[PDB]
Subunit: 317 residues, 4 copies
């Protein structure tokens, strides 16, 4: 029996609404927009429903406040969060969003425990780890969207320097989705050409590369300070959809995301940004980049950053 | 010389941002997001830029507050308006938005007078007429988005009754974008089958048809009541993109929109919702539907309702 | 468990290869190209495989001569046929292609009896009926591609007259895929406007309409006489894919195709061209067009044509 | 003035027809299918025209034998060649195809001298050089399709070893389109990970890499041996479309193709397979890969192999 693909979006704010919009536009799946706030998901679902005929999609998009409606969901995308943008650090939402995810975990565990779960809620890496422990879902079926967003920014900034199509830039950001984030310059290439060659050719300087690395790391504030009323939401939505595509279409796509890293990068069992292979069984493998001694040290510092915020959460009131 | 297609979006609020997102996603054109509000268009443009590599698009999307940047725009889409949603009627925003469109008119006249202009700002039909007068652009290069949204809603509700793909429903809403809009039930077909045949076959009643007609006319309120923060914006954005597509691709597509009707539907020279043919020369034609006497009268009421609001604008302080 | 969608293409000639190409391009499913001819499916599958990375699709396309490889197929598309184009009538291939379908029926019945089967092999309507009887598959899970091709031609010719987008022309061809084919002029509309109105407006004559009807009926020879080495294959392939999409995505799409018509159009249980609704359960409903007395008579003549060729087959050597 | 994009396809055989099909499907441009063979281009154009409404495209596709019809073409793609496949080497077709391209050269020079020309006719690199000389078009507006096909094969085979999405493999083939082609294994990465790292990790051996390199170079024979009626045509068609896209959309895309290399890879002014940047001005740049000494030598052999065949053409009867 052919059953329609089904994606549950938990939290129908800025990011949640865009996800439903894009999923519906692509006819990737039916969408269930869940929110505790009255009217909002229903209003967005009705609005998006009207656009479906315009896009030529037969996707159904509905709004709900009832976890029963997410039963049979193939993918669950968690965007739920307490109000207000972070001032200086994504960790400011730690305590509130952890409690939200406790509730979301009970909903998923009861109504769709076989779903592939993509966490978006900040602070991403710690939230992903929290959700996995509380929900009890397999490690390979729970991950966090971050790397795709960070790497896309990294790739975009490199592409903007050289004036080329960003799709032809290969570039990875790894580690935690925070200031300790590691854009791995060593394995950057533009159509096969490494950055070291472009330096010799006089087309880019090491200082320009450092500026691009810094830009990647602080990119979230650049967007947030301009929007004023919140953080980025167009690209993070698109990124979550790319991850859902990889699972639903069994792409074996290489996806940088927050995944349970057990026998790679010198860590013994932690959720952090790593290049994964995603397919019909969720996170199916992790790829090991060729890191320089400096990059290994920077990754080490990112890991400490993650563990620090995680311990703070473990000692929450 | 091959040149990139360019779409200027005047007003980077709810609808404007979504237009930029979708246009970018489809790689239909480069986008210039214009707004007077500080930060907003810049923030959205940067966020949407980060998503382009995720979508595999090379569209550039920039934010600005300078009309010089809309220079050489192939299409201009106007979403600019005063804040706050309408409580009962779209006409409450009349005088404020008229002042705004004067600024846009002088901007377009100076920097891109050959552009195809699609107005979205409410009250739609009067705003379109106003923009054409002040800007001095050809009647065929200036129209308003409404019919696509209204017809899409009409098609969606018919499709939901019969349980079929809305894309296989043909249906038009004509007249002004307001309570007086005419969902032409005589124009309706589902896979070639007219509503009269469905009544005879006992697959729909006249009461159900009346309900669908009513639903269409007040659909905006159903969305707005649930959103709380404002009016519909996912579907209106998509509708504008469909109209921009018809122009940029020279589709010769049937597009219900607010266009200068000079010798059809028993009017002499007025902007109202009619089925047009849109291609590379803007509004290239208007189709004459086979309206019943009741529908002709309903359309007459709509025309007067439009003329009423238009005269009030002519008698300004 | 997410399993990839799988389409089996039985016969890897002109049409079969294009189907695999388009399915792969769209990433609609994995494709199995089956043929008894050595090398051909394998060569086409390898060639098409190389194009997948270019299209950004992860679809797997393989060639085979083994029916075991079509097990678990969601859709089976039958293109298998004896060599050579028909001279004057599609019925010339009757006896040979019936025997091929006996063999194909055994393959499907054994390895994928729950598949949605779309027959393409000519003479279409009789071949569809033959396959259903020999295979023993449910009537709603076996249909023939024809109406989509015939209607697309009908729509295209109307659209070419008016100089508009063919997607905005609603037009149906019903009955058997042969000379008795019935393009139903009565229910043609262009953006809501019926042909009767265009006649009054002086934009089309009844003689031009008759020419378009004739063109639709003899369209196959116009293509075949130009190609010389065979019959049409680009559009029939595309048409089969549209039908596969409707099933796999549960579109509830209105699809004119050869379906088992039991309580409609005055027939008591025959495969002929009718507007169907297709979804995850195959042919889920049949729509009844509003036919004129003349059109009812023409349909009657088409039905006789179908029954005549069917009786000939029943008395085969 | 908005004008439709126009692509002329010179030669409506296996590849030419597929190009028209895909270009139409994507609504990338209008297509003119040119051929001297009677009926063929007309038959394919009509067949493909019928599919346009199925794809929701408004692209026009016409067939012709008159060069006046390629007037105003933005892109010209040359597939014209003498019949019969190569047995061992692509160079067997040298003199025949050279005569053909003289006709095409004079046609393009007369009717669309500002066109971007993509040659496909074998022997590719020599034919490209020949067409440029005879036609007198700028070096940057004339290139050949080969690298995209060779690189796509290379990427596909690497991806199949690692079991990942080929789109996430970066890999280049450079030099002439023949046995001397250089799959640059030093350029290869899979999600940022180079082959050297995969060897160290025990996920691939050097022998397996050597096999992949060999597979790439003789991939054309594997397809041709299985097709029997001719050489590959699904993937070569798709490759040409990707190149046309880069030009028409001004992508600034990294495209390995046969381009006029004047001051890179240690050559003075020759057409050979190199990574280019393609945008609205044709070949806008050439990237310099970080080749090993072995790869530099292999490339040197390829350059001579190309020069050999080129000199034979210069010494015609
Ligand atoms: N991982 C990343 O790269 C990344 C990028 C950007 C934003 N984010 C994060 O994503 C989250 C969402 O961002 P946003 O802009 O959509 O926020 P938002 O405030 O617009 O939306 C949050 C929504 O969650 C809902 N909600 C609150 N409590 C809930 C509960 N218990 N159950 C269900 N829903 C609940 C709210 O009603 C609201 O609609 C934030 O935590 C943000 O920091 C992450
Ligand atoms: N035609 C339809 O069917 C339809 C449907 C929905 C909404 N609308 C209308 O579309 C308009 C926009 O809706 P929205 O939700 O995007 O509103 P919004 O408030 O989110 O956006 C309006 C934007 O216009 C900007 N603006 C204000 N003054 C300006 C000026 N002088 N120049 C340039 N920009 C200026 C604001 O900064 C704001 O960003 C409204 O008038 C609404 O009623 C029409
Ligand atoms: N329904 C329609 O609208 C429509 C339109 C066009 C063509 N057609 C029909 O579709 C059929 C295929 O057309 P085509 O151009 O692809 O023909 P083709 O000759 O190019 O391909 C037929 C293929 O079937 C294979 N074949 C033969 N016997 C077989 C068997 N027992 N099992 C499996 N495969 C076998 C052959 O090897 C060949 O590759 C023809 O009957 C044609 O008349 C139908
Ligand atoms: N670059 C690559 O990687 C690559 C890959 C595959 C094939 N090819 C080459 O592409 C070419 C075409 O392949 P195909 O399979 O389409 O061949 P084909 O024989 O199917 O098509 C060639 C067409 O050219 C036409 N033609 C002959 N003389 C002509 C003239 N003077 N003007 C215009 N048209 C003329 C023929 O009528 C025929 O339709 C071949 O040379 C082949 O070797 C190149």
């Amino acid at each position: 029996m052919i059953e329609r693909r089904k994606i549950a979006v938990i939290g129908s704010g800025q990011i949640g609404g865009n996800i439903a919009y894009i999923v519906g536009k692509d006819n990737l799946a039916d969408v269930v927009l869940f929110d505790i706030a009255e009217g909002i998901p229903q209003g967005k679902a009705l609005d998006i429903t009207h656009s479906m005929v315009m896009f030529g999609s037969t996707s159904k998009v509905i709004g709900t406040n009832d976890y029963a409606d997410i039963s049979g969901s193939d993918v669950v995308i968690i965007t739920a969060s307490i109000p207000g943008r972070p001032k200086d650090d994504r960790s400011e939402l730690l305590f509130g969003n952890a409690r939200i995810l406790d509730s979301v975990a009970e909903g998923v565990k009861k109504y769709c425990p076989n779903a592939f779960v993509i966490c978006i809620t900040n602070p991403l890496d710690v939230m992903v780890s929290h959700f996995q422990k509380v929900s009890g879902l397999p490690h390979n079926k729970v991950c966090g969207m971050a790397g795709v967003l960070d790497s896309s920014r990294f790739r975009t900034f490199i592409a903007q320097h050289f004036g080329v199509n960003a799709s032809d830039v290969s570039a990875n950001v790894i580690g935690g989705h925070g200031d300790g984030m590691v854009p791995a310059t060593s394995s950057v290439s533009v159509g096969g050409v490494p950055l070291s060659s472009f330096i010799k050719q006089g087309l880019i300087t090491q200082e320009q590369i450092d500026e691009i690395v810094c830009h990647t790391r602080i990119a979230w504030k650049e967007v947030a300070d301009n929007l004023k009323t919140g953080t980025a939401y167009f690209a993070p939505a698109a990124a979550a959809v790319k991850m859902a595509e990889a699972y639903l279409k069994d792409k074996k796509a290489v996806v940088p995301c927050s995944a349970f890293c057990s026998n790679h990068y010198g860590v013994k069992g932690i959720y952090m940004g790593v290049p994964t292979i995603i397919g019909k069984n969720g996170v199916e493998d992790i790829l090991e980049l060729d890191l320089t001694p400096l990059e290994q040290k920077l990754l080490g510092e990112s890991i400490n950053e993650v563990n620090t915020i995680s311990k703070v959460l473990d000692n929450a009131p």
